[PDB]
Each structure stands twice: as C-alpha cells, then as structure tokens.
Amino acid sequence: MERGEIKNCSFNITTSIRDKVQKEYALFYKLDVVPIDNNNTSY
C-alpha cells in the first residue's frame, strides 16, 4: 500500500477577492484524484 495513496498537491486559486492568485498546497487521496496525459507531477 505504498503507491502514493496520500498525495501532496499545489495549485493557484483566487481568494475571497479577485486581486490575489495565491499558490496554495493541500493533501489528497489517490482515489480522490486523477492524473492527466503523461504522468507528470500533474493531477
């Protein structure tokens, strides 16, 4: 069970306010998330 079930991911979002694209980091489960194209660092 060491395929990467818990994953640490980053992404940019606009806050309560449209004047801040804050690069935030959060955790996800391998099932709760799905990759794109080649398995880069991107899900």
Ligand X SMILES: *[C@@H]1O[C@H](CO)[C@@H](O[C@@H]2O[C@H](CO)[C@@H](O[C@@H]3O[C@H](CO[C@H]4O[C@H](CO[C@H]5O[C@H](CO)[C@@H](O)[C@H](O)[C@@H]5O[C@H]5O[C@H](CO)[C@@H](O)[C@H](O)[C@@H]5O)[C@@H](O)[C@H](O[C@H]5O[C@H](CO)[C@@H](O)[C@H](O)[C@@H]5O)[C@@H]4O)[C@@H](O)[C@H](O)[C@@H]3O)[C@H](O)[C@H]2NC(C)=O)[C@H](O)[C@H]1NC(C)=O
C-alpha distances out from residue 37 to 3, 4, 12, 13, 18, Å? 19, 18, 20, 22, 30
CB closer to ligand X out of 10 and 38: 38
From the list 15, 24, 29, 33, which residue makes contact with a second copy (rule: CB under 8 A)?
15
CB closer to ligand X out of 14 and 42: 42
Quick check: 7 and 29 in contact, CB under 8 A? yes
Select from a second copy, ligand X, none the partner in contact with residue 16, using the beta carbon and a kind-dependent cut-off of 5 to 8 Å.
a second copy
What tokens does 42 get?
């991107």
Where on the chain is the footprint of a second copy (CB under 8 A)?
15-19
